[PDB]
Structures are given as structure tokens and as C-alpha cells.
């Protein structure tokens, strides 16, 4: 017990290493244990990580009578007697420790006073979504780490020089992350009256899989717009057929507009998923308006209008697909 | 120190394909030797104790690598168990509720077959 009780005696966890001297260097490191999918409704995402920290503390310099392997793996519950950098997550809506059998913490104390602390967190980070070109978009969610009670004169973070983020296999439901930019070590926040506070962030990139929407939104909506076109070859005297056949093309499209936006944030700007539905909602309505133009022609050879409309809307609509899918994809 | 541990699951349920997880409460038992608990005072092979004494002995800090949310049960007392055998063998049973997360392959959703796991992992102690 004297390998550790001889160090903590005369040790003060209220005083950082090198109190009036240089700042304390904290080499931040992270292992992503699980990466929850983005919640578009709340603009956040749930992540389970292993936050690692590695600073120097010259009062924890192990004696010369300690062989060890290379470190001094101690009781994880011994963290409460050491100094620890007080870094919070400037994006987290609600974070969480983990004590499932006991509190999940590492504590390595190397021979030269170097210290390693590996918390195990579950963070609900908030990243604003730019839902323009919605199904074919790509977001960038931040994980800003930051000090709170120590200015840059006292505490100072910096990423691991190798691989700071160590994600291995996540495979989100409709996202994916391969390689990104662990940038902005100069992220240091400035707050009026308090000062400069250290910041380091990783901005993941999250491409979206359009597979779910090609068979849940675009596929069924496309056949309904083709369903409206069936009313062109039908005999125009059948008033009770082409009219109900056209009202369906606006009713079902109108229903899909509400059903899709019901599980998304209420952003006030047209997104790519709305340009499609609003366009298809007009091709359906335009076909029904076409019948009114033909019905009036009988009130006086209106088949020419349907003939000119048989091979016009498919051209006027397939022309839309080239313009639409080339812009957003 | 190696710890032979076993599980007794009281109940599954709330297996959510949307949330992609499942809830379960278990009695995580785990046994290890502790040579400085062997005694010659009482002639009893095993010896149950107050779970309040469970906070003064060493305990392996295992976690569930995919637990996704857990909590002890504190209803009316600590739901902890402790019997120190007379050679050092420490038994340790605690009730735990786990909202474990298991990724589901829904390629054949209505009539699929899932395989949800439960990883009991150490955190603060290396393999030696």
C-alpha cells in the first residue's frame, strides 16, 4: 500500500500540477464504443465513447524503489484523490456517466508522474441539421471538448498526435463515417469577463443512405403520378372515371406530403424531398385540369388534346427527372 | 485474479427494432479467490454476510460493453449478496437491469432470427 499511500500523503487535489508555472497539458483521446443515429426531430445524436486523458503531474512521480511493468494500474475508485481536468462537452444536451457494477474509470500512473484517465461516457450531442437536399444531404456533427474553470493560462488541451478518434465499426442505420477532420485545436473559446477557454473538436461527416427513400417515398409516389396518366386513353365520355382517377392523384400525394414531414424537424425552407412531392402533386393536378380542358371542348374533336397529352406529360415529366436527379444527386 | 461469473435472467422484453435494443434484468454472480479473507474462527464452510459489508472488499469492475443504460436496484435495500467462503472464495450476486443494444439484420424482417449479445467486460484492469 505504501506505493500509493506514500504519494497521496502531502498531495492536494485542489491544486493543479505546476500551480504558478506553465499550463497543464492534456492529450485528449477518444474511442467510439457506439454511435447512435441522428435524431432529426431533436437535432441530436447519442454516442457512447471512452474519453481518455493523459497529462503530467510531477507530484505523482513513482519512487525509484518501484519496478512495476511500466505503469501503476490502481483502483479505479482512486480517481477522487487526484487532480483532474474539468472538460465538458459544449454540444451535449444530456450526458451520463456509467456505473453498471462500479464506476467505469481507468487510472494509470506512469513512472514520471504521467497520468492516464479513461472515463466511459454516453453523450447526447446536439448538431444542427441543414436539411436542404434532404434525402441526399450530408451533415457534420461536432464533439467539442472544452475546459470550464481553467483558462488557457492554466489548462490546455490537444488531440492525440496519432489517431484521436478510434472508431472501428459502427454501421449506422442510414448513415456512415469513414474518415474526417479532427480539426481546430485553436477552437479556444473567448468569453467576456472570464477569458480564453480551451477547445478541441471532431466534426464527423454523415452521408445519408437514400435507399430507404427510394422505396418508401420516391417509388410509391412515382407510380401514383403514372396512375394519373391512365385517364388519357380512357374514353372521354366516361366523366365518372377520369375525374375520380385524377382526384386520387392529388389526394394521395397530398397525404404523402404530411406523412413524410410528420417525423422531421419543422425547418422553414424547401428541401429536396418537398420539391419532388410538390412537383408530383402538380403533375397529378395538371392531368385533372387537362380533363377540364377536354370536357369544355366537347361543349361546342377533343381527342387531339388527349392525343397531344398522351405523349407530352411523360415527356414533360421524364424531363423533370433529369433536371431533379442531376441537381440533388 | 480470475472471476468465474454466471447470469440469471429474470425477464426479456421491450425488444425494440426501432430503438434497436432490449431490456433485461439479471443476477450477475461472480466468484473469485481473495487469500486475505480466509478465516479459522468460525467452523462454517460458507458464511453469508450483510450486503452493507459488500462495500469494503475488492470487487471486479466489470461493465457491459453494449449495456446502453443500466441501474442497480435499491428497492427497500441494496439488492446485493455476499458470502465469504472460509478459504477466501467470495461470492457476489447483484441485481441489474440492462437495456442492452443488439444490431438487428432485418433482411427478412417478419420471419427473421436475431442474435443479441451480452458482453461482460473489465474496464480498469488489464488482462494480467
Amino acid at each position: 500500500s505504501n506505493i500509493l499511500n506514500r504519494l497521496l500523503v502531502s498531495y492536494d487535489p485542489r491544486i493543479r500540477p505546476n500551480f504558478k508555472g506553465i499550463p497543464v497539458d492534456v492529450v485528449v483521446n477518444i474511442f467510439i464504443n457506439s454511435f447512435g443515429s441522428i435524431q432529426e426531430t431533436t437535432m441530436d445524436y447519442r454516442v457512447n465513447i471512452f474519453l481518455r486523458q493523459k497529462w503530467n503531474d510531477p507530484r505523482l512521480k513513482l519512487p525509484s524503489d518501484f519496478r512495476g511493468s511500466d505503469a501503476l494500474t490502481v483502483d479505479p475508485t482512486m480517481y477522487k484523490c487526484l487532480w483532474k481536468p474539468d472538460l465538458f462537452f459544449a454540444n451535449e444536451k444530456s450526458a451520463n456517466f456509467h456505473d453498471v457494477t462500479q464506476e467505469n474509470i481507468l487510472l494509470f500512473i506512469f513512472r514520471d508522474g504521467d497520468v492516464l484517465v479513461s472515463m466511459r461516457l454516453s453523450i447526447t450531442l446536439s448538431c444542427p441539421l441543414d436539411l436542404t437536399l434532404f434525402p441526399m444531404d450530408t451533415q457534420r456533427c461536432k464533439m467539442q471538448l472544452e475546459s470550464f474553470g481553467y483558462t488557457t493560462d492554466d489548462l490546455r488541451f490537444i488531440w492525440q498526435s496519432g489517431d484521436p478518434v478510434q472508431l472501428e465499426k459502427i454501421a449506422l442505420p442510414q448513415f456512415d463515417i469513414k474518415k474526417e477532420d479532427i480539426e481546430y485545436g485553436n477552437c479556444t473559446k473567448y468569453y467576456k469577463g472570464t477569458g480564453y477557454y480551451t477547445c478541441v473538436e471532431v466534426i464527423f461527416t454523415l452521408r445519408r443512405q437514400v435507399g430507404f427513400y427510394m422505396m418508401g417515398v420516391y417509388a410509391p409516389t412515382l407510380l401514383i403520378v403514372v396512375l394519373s396518366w391512365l385517364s388519357f386513353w380512357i374514353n372521354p365520355d366516361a366523366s365518372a372515371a377520369r375525374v375520380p382517377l385524377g382526384i386520387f392523384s392529388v389526394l394521395s400525394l397530398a397525404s404523402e406530403c404530411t406523412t413524410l414531414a410528420a417525423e422531421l424537424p419543422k425547418v422553414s425552407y424547401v428541401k429536396a424531398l418537398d420539391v419532388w412531392l410538390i412537383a408530383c402533386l402538380l403533375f397529378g393536378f395538371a392531368s385533372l385540369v387537362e380533363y377540364a380542358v377536354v370536357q369544355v371542348m366537347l361543349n361546342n374533336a377533343a381527342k387531339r388534346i388527349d392525343l397531344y397529352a398522351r405523349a407530352l406529360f411523360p415527356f414533360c415529366f421524364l424531363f423533370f427527372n433529369v433536371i431533379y436527379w442531376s441537381i440533388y444527386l | 485474479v480470475n472471476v468465474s461469473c454466471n447470469i440469471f435472467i429474470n425477464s426479456f422484453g421491450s425488444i425494440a427494432e426501432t430503438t434497436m435494443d432490449y431490456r433485461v434484468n439479471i443476477f450477475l454472480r461472480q466468484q473469485w479467490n481473495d487469500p486475505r479473507l480466509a478465516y479459522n474462527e468460525y467452523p462454517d464452510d460458507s458464511l453469508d454476510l450483510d450486503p452493507s459489508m459488500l462495500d469494503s472488499i475488492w470487487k471486479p469492475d466489470l461493465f457491459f460493453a453494449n449495456e446502453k443504460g443500466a441501474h442497480f436496484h435499491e428497492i427497500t435495500t441494496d439488492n446485493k449478496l455476499l458470502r465469504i467462503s472460509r478459504n477466501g472464495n467470495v461470492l457476489y450476486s447483484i441485481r441489474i437491469t440492462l437495456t442492452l443494444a443488439c444490431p438487428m439484420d432485418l433482411k427478412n424482417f417478419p420471419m427473421d432470427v436475431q442474435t443479441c449479445i451480452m458482453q461482460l467486460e473489465s474496464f480498469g484492469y488489464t488482462m494480467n
Partner: antibody, heavy 115, light 102 residues
Framework: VQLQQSGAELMKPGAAVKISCKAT????????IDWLKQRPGHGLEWIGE????????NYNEKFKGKATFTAEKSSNTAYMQLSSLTSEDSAVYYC???????????WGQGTTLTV | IVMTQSHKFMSTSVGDRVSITCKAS??????VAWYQQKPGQSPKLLIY???TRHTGVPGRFTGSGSGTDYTLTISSVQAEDLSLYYC?????????FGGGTK
């Protein structure tokens, strides 16, 4: 789990060779890949270790600079590069791997080096 | 740590009991492994933690000892036991082996 190295190597002094360790059976970024040296007349010797996913390495103090560990998840292979080859480097080089401890229970067939 | 085997070559007949001492330098007290390397192949693992066996090893190999002085033991030497035997400490970072016994 298996570790398939490259073939035999023949180099000249001053040059530098890179030995691969093709992990066939598991993702290379999963376990520590250790590197050993067997020089005849003498015994084995531990070069270092590299976790092929996080780029973390713990070289032996005798082989610092002499050896460089790298990885490439495009093919699940861990590399080692020996710089400033000399006649002392004539030996067989292995890429062991210890799963449940700091022992070496998974080995490679070997890669003979002759400076 | 400097693991040492003070017998480079040992003599034994088929069906003998032989002890191979690997006297450690400092106190590891359990961290010892024993390897077997037939000529032209990788050293396969026999014992780890000085008393446990590996998956697929014959039961005639037995590790013992603790602290500094360790020992491998082969109860009934067969014909395949005529090879090199390496001890290995896995207690510290620089993992020396200790030369080898024949």
C-alpha cells in the same frame, strides 16, 4: 485466426525493407500485432507492438528508430520497416499476436532476412 | 527483466523427467510462458502464466515455480519433445525470453 507473412527477403547494407503480416481470419484493427526477431546463435527478441486501427505502437527500447510499425486496413495487413540494415539484422522476423494476455499464441511462418 | 536458462543443451532419454529452469531477474511471480520451436517453424505456445496449458497441447507438459525460479516439466518424453524450448516473461513491456534450452 491466422497470420500469413510475406516471403524471404535479401537486402544490402544501408537499405530498408518492409515486412508484411497478412491477417487472414480477423479484422487487422482488432488485436495487437506483435513483432519478434529470431537471430541464430542468439535467442528470440521482442521488437514491439502496433494496434493496427489506432496507430498505437510500443517499440522496444533497443529497436527505437531501427523499426517502424504501420498498418493498412485496405487489405488487413500490418507492416514493419527496418531502416539502416546491417549484418547484425540477419535473422528471422515473426509477427506474433497475444489475444488473452501478453504471451504469443498466434505466430507467423517467418520471413528470413539476410543483409 | 533478464530471463535466463542456464542449460543450453539437456540430455534425456525417451521416457524421462526433465526440468528446465528459467531463473527470472526480478519478481514477476506468475508471468512465464514456455514455447516449443521445431527446426524451421514458429515457436508454438505450451504454457502461459507458468501453470496453464494452451488449446491443443498434450498433457505431459507441466509448468511450476513462482517468484523468480521457474521450471518446465515433461513427465514422459516422447520423440517429438526433441526440440528447442523457450521461456518467456509477460509481466513487463520489454519482453525478453531468455536464450533457449535444447
Amino acid at each position: 485466426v491466422q497470420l500469413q507473412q510475406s516471403g524471404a527477403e535479401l537486402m544490402k547494407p544501408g537499405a530498408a525493407v518492409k515486412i508484411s503480416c497478412k491477417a487472414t481470419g480477423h479484422t487487422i484493427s482488432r488485436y495487437w500485432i506483435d513483432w519478434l526477431k529470431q537471430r541464430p546463435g542468439h535467442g528470440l527478441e521482442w521488437i514491439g507492438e502496433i494496434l493496427p486501427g489506432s496507430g498505437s505502437t510500443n517499440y522496444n527500447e533497443k529497436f527505437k528508430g531501427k523499426a517502424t510499425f504501420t498498418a493498412e486496413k485496405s487489405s488487413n495487413t500490418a507492416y514493419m520497416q527496418l531502416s539502416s540494415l546491417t549484418s547484425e539484422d540477419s535473422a528471422v522476423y515473426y509477427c506474433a499476436m497475444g489475444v488473452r494476455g501478453n504471451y504469443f499464441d498466434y505466430w507467423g511462418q517467418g520471413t528470413t532476412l539476410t543483409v | 527483466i533478464v530471463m535466463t536458462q542456464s542449460h543450453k543443451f539437456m540430455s534425456t532419454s525417451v521416457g524421462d523427467r526433465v526440468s528446465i529452469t528459467c531463473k527470472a531477474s526480478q519478481d514477476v511471480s506468475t508471468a512465464v510462458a514456455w514455447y516449443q520451436q521445431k527446426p524451421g517453424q514458429s515457436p508454438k505456445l505450451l504454457i502461459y502464466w507458468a501453470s496453464t496449458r494452451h488449446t491443443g497441447v498434450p498433457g505431459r507438459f507441466t509448468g511450476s515455480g513462482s517468484g523468480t525460479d521457474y521450471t518446465l516439466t515433461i513427465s514422459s518424453v516422447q520423440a517429438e519433445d526433441l526440440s528447442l524450448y523457450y521461456c518467456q516473461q509477460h509481466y513487463s513491456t520489454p519482453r525478453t525470453f531468455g536464450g533457449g534450452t535444447k
